[PDB]
mmCIF file with all atom_site columns, C-alpha atoms and ligand atoms in Angstrom:
data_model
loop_
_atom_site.group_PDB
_atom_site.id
_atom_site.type_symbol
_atom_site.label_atom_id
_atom_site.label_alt_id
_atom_site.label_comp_id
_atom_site.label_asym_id
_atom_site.label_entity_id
_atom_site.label_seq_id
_atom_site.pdbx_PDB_ins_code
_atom_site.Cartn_x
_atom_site.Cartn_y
_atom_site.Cartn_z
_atom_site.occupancy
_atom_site.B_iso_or_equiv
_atom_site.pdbx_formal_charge
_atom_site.auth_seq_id
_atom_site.auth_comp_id
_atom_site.auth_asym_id
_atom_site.auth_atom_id
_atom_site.pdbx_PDB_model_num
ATOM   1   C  CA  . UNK A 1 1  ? 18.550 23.761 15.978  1.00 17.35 ? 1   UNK A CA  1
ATOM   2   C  CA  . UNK A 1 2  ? 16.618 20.762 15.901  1.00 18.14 ? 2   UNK A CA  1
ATOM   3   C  CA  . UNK A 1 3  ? 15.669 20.897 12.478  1.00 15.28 ? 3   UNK A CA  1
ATOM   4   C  CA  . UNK A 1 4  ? 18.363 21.841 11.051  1.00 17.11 ? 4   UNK A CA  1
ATOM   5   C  CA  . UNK A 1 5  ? 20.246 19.039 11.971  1.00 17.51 ? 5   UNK A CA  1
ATOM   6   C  CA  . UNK A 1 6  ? 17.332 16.739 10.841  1.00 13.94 ? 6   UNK A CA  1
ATOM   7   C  CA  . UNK A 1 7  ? 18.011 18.821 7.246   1.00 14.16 ? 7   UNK A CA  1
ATOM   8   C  CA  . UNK A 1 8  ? 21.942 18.211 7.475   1.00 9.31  ? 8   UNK A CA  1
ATOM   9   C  CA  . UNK A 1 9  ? 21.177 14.724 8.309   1.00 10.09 ? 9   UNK A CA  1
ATOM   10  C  CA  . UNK A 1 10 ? 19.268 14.640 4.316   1.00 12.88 ? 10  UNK A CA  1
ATOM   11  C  CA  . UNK A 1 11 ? 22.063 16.040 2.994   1.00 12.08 ? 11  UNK A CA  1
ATOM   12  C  CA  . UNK A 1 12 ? 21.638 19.913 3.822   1.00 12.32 ? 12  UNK A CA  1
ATOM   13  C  CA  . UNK A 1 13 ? 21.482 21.576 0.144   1.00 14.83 ? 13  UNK A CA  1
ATOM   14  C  CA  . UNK A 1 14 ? 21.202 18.477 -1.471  1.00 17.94 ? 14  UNK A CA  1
ATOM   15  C  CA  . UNK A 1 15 ? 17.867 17.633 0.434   1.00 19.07 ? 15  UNK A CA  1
ATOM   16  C  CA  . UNK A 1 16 ? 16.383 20.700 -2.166  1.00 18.80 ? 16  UNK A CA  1
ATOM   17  C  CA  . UNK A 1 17 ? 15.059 22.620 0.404   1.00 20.71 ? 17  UNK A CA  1
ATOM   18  C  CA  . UNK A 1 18 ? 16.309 25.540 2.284   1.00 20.93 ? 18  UNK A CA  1
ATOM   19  C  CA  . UNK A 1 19 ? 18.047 25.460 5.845   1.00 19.16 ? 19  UNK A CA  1
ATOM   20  C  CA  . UNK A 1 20 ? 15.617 25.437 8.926   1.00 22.01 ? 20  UNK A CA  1
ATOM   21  C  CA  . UNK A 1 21 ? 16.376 28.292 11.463  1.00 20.76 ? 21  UNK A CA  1
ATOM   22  C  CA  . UNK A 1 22 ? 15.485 25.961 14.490  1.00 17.39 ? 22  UNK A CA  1
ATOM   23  C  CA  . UNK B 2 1  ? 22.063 27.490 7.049   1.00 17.06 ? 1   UNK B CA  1
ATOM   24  C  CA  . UNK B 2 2  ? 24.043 26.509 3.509   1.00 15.47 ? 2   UNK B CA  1
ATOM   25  C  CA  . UNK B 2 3  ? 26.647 28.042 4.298   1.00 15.20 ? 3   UNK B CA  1
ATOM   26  C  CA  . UNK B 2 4  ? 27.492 27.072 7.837   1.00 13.29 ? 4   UNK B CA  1
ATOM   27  C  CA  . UNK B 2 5  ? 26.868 23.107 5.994   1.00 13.54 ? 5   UNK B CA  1
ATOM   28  C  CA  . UNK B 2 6  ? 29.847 23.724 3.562   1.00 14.15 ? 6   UNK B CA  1
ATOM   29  C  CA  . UNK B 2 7  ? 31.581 24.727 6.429   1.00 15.08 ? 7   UNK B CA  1
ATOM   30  C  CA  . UNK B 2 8  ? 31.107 21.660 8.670   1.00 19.80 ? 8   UNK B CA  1
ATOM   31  C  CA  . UNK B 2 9  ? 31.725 19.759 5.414   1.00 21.70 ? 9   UNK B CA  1
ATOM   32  C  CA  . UNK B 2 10 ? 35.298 21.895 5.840   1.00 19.38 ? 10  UNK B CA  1
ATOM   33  C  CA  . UNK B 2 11 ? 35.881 20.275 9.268   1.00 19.33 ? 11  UNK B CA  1
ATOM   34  C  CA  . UNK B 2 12 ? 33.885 22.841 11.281  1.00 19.53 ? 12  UNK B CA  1
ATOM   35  C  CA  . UNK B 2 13 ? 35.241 23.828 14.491  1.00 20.48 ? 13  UNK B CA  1
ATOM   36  C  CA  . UNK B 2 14 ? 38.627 22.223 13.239  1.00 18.00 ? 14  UNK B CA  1
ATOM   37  C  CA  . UNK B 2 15 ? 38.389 24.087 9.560   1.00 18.83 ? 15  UNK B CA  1
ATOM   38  C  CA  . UNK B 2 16 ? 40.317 27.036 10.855  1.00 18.79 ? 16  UNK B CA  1
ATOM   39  C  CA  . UNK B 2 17 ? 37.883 29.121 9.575   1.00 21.06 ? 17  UNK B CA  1
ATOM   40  C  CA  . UNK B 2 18 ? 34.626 30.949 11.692  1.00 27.52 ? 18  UNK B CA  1
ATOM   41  C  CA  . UNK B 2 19 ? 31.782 29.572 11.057  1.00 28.94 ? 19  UNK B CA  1
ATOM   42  C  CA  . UNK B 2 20 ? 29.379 31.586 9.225   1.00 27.44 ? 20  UNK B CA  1
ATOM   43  C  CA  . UNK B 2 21 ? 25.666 32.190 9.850   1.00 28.26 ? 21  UNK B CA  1
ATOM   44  C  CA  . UNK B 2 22 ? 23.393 31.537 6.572   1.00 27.55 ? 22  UNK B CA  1
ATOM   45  C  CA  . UNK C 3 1  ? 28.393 27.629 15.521  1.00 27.61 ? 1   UNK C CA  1
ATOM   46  C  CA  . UNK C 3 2  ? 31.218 26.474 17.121  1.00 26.45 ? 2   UNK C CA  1
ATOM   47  C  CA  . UNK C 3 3  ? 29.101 24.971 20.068  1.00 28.94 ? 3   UNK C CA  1
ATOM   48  C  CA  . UNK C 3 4  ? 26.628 23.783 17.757  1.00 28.30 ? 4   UNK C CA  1
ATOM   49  C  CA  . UNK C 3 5  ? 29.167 21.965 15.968  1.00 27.98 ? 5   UNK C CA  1
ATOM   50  C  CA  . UNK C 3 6  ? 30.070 20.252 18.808  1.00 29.77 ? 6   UNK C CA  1
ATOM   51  C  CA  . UNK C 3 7  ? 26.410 19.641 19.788  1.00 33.21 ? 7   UNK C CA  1
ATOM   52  C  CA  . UNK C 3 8  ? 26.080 17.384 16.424  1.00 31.78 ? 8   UNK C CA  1
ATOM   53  C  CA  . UNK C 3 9  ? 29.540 15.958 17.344  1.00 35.10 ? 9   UNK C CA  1
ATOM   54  C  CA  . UNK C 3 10 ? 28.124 14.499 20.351  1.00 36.10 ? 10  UNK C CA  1
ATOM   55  C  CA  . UNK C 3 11 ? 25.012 13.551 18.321  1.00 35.02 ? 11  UNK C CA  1
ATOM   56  C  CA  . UNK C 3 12 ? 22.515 16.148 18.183  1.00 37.15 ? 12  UNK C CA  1
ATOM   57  C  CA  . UNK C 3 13 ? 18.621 15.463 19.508  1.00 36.53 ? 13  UNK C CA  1
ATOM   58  C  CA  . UNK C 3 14 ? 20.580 12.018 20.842  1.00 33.89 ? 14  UNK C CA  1
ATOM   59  C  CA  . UNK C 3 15 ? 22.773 14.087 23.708  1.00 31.92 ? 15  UNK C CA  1
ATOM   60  C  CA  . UNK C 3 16 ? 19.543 15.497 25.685  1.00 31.88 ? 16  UNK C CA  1
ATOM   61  C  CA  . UNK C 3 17 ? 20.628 19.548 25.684  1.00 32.82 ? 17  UNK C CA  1
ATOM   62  C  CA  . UNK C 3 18 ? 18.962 22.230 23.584  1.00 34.57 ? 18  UNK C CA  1
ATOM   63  C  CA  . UNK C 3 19 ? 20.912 22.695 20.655  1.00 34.47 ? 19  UNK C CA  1
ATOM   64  C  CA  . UNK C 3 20 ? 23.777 25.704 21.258  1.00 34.67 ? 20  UNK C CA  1
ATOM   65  C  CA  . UNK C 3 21 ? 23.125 29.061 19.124  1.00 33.60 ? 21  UNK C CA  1
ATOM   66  C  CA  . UNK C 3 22 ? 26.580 29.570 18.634  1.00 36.92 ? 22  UNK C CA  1
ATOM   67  C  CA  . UNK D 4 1  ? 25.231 4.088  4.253   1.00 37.91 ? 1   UNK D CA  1
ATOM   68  C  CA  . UNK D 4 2  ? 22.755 4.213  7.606   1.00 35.81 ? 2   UNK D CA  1
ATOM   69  C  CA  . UNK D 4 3  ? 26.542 4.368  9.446   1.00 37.82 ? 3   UNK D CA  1
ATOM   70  C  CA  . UNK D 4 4  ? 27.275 6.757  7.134   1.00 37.06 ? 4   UNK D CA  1
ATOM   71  C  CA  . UNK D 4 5  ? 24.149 8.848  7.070   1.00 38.84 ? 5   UNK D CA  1
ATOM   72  C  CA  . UNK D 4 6  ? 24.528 8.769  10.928  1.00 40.06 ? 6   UNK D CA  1
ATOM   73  C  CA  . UNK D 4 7  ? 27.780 10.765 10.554  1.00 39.37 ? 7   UNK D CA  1
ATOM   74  C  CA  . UNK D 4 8  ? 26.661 13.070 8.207   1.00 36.89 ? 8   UNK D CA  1
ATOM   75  C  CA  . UNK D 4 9  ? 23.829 13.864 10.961  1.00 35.63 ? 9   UNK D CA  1
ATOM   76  C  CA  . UNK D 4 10 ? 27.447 14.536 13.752  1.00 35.57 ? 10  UNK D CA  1
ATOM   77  C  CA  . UNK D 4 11 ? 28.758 16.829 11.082  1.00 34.15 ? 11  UNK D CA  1
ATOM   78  C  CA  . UNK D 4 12 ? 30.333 14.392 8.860   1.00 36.27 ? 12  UNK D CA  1
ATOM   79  C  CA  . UNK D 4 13 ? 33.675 15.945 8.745   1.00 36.91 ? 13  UNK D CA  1
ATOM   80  C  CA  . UNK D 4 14 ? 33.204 18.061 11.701  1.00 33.89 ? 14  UNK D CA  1
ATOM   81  C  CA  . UNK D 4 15 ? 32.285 15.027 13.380  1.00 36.66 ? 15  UNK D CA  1
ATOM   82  C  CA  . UNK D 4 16 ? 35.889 14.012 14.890  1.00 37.64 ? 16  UNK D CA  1
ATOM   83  C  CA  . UNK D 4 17 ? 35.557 10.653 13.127  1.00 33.81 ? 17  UNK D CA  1
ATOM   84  C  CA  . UNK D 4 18 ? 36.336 8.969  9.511   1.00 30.59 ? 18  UNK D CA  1
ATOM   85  C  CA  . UNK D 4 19 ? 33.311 8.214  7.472   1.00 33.40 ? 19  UNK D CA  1
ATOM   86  C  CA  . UNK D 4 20 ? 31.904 4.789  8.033   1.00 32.89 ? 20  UNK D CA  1
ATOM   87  C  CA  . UNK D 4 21 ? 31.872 2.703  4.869   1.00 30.90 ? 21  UNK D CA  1
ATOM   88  C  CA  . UNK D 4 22 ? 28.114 1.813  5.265   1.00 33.20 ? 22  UNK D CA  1
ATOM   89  C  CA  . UNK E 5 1  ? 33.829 9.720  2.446   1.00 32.83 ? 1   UNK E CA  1
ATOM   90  C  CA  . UNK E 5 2  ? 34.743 13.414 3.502   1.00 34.59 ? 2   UNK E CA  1
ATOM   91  C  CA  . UNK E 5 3  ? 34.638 14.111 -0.085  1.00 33.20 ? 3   UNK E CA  1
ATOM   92  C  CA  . UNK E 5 4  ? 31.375 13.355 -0.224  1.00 31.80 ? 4   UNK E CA  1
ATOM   93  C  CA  . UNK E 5 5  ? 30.094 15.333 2.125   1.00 31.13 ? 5   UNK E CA  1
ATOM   94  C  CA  . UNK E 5 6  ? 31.749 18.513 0.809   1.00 30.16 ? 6   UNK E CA  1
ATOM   95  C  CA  . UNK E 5 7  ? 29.308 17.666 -2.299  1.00 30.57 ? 7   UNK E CA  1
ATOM   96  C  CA  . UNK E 5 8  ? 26.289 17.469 -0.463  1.00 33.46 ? 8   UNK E CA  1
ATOM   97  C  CA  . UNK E 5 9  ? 26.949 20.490 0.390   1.00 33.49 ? 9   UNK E CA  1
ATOM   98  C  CA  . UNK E 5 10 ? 27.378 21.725 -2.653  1.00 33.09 ? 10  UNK E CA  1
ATOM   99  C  CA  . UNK E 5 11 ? 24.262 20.656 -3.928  1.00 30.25 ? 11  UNK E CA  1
ATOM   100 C  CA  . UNK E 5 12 ? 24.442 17.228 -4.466  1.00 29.13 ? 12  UNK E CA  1
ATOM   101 C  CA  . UNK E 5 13 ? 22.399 16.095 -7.077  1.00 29.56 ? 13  UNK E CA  1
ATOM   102 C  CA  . UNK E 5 14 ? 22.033 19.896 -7.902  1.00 30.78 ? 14  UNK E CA  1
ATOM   103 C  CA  . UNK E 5 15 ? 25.682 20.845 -7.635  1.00 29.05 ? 15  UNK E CA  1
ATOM   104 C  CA  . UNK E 5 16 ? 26.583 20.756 -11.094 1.00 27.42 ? 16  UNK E CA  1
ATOM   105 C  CA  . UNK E 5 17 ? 29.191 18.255 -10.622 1.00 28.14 ? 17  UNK E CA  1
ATOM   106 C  CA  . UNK E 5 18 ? 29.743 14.220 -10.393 1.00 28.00 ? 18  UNK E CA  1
ATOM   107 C  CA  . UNK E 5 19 ? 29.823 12.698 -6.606  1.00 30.81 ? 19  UNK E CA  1
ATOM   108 C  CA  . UNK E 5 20 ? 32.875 11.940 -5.317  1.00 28.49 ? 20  UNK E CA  1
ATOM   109 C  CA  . UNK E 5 21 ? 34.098 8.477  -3.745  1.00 29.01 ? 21  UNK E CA  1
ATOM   110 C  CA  . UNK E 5 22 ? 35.253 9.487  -0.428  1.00 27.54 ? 22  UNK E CA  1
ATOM   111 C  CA  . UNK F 6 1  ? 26.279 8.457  -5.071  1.00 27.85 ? 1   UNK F CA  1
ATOM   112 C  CA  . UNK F 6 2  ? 23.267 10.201 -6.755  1.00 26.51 ? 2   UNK F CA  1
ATOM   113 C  CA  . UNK F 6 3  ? 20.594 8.128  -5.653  1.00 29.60 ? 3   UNK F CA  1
ATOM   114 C  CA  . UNK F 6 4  ? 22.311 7.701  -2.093  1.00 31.78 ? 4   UNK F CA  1
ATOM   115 C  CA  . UNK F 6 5  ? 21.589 11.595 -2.150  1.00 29.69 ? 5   UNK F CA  1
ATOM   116 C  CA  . UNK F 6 6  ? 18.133 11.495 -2.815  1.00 31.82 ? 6   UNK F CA  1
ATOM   117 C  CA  . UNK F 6 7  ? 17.925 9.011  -0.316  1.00 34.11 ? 7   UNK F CA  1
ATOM   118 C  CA  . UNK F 6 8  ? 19.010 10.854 2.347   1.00 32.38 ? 8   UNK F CA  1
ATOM   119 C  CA  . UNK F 6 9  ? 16.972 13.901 0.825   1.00 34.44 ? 9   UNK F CA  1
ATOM   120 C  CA  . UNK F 6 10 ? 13.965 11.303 1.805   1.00 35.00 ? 10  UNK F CA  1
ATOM   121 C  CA  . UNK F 6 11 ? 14.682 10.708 5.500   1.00 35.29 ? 11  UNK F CA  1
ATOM   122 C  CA  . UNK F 6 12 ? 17.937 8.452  5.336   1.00 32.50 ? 12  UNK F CA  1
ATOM   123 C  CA  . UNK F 6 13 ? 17.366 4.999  7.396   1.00 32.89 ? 13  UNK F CA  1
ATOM   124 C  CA  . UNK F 6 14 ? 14.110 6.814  8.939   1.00 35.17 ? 14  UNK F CA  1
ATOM   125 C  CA  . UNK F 6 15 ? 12.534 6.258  5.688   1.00 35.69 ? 15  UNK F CA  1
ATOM   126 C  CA  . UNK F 6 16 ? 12.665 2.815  6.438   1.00 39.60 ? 16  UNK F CA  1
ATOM   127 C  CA  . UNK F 6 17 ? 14.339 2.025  2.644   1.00 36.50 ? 17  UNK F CA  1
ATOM   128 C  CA  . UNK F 6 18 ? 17.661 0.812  2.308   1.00 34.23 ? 18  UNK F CA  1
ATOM   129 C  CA  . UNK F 6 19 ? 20.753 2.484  1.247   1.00 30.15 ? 19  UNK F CA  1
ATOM   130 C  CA  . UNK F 6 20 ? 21.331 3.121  -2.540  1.00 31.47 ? 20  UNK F CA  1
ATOM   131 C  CA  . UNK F 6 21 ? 25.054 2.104  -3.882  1.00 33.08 ? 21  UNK F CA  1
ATOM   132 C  CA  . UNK F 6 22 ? 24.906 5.082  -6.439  1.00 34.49 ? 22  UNK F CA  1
HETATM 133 CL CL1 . CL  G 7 .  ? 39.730 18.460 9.443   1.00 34.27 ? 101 CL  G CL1 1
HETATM 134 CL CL1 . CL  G 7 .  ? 25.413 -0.108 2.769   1.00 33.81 ? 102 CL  G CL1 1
#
């Protein structure tokens, strides 16, 4: 959960990397 | 993960639509 | 999701709970 | 754009707010 | 804005498309 | 809007770097 929303926070998909499970 | 993001881009919660799991 | 949703809402990491699962 | 990258990071759009301009 | 962030997730950069104003 | 996305793809305001226009 936490990293995930570090990952939507750089843009989710458009970060180029896939989706944390956390 | 991606798609649960294109759902909160949707409005989430207030989308009308459940959110999904990937 | 939905709760997790809401989690972000109230800004993530920045609200002190663990992140929902739903 | 940091106001705006902050809102992305609530869900952007499932947020419950309008996207800041910065 | 809300646009936007229906791009991101999308793909952004990698969605095959031009990014939107709002 | 491009480079705003791979600026948030790069850690957003945590990077330290200021917001792109594009
Ligand atoms: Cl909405
Ligand atoms: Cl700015």
């Amino acid at each position: 959960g936490d990293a995930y929303a570090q990952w939507l926070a750089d843009g989710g998909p458009s970060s180029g990397r896939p989706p944390p499970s956390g």
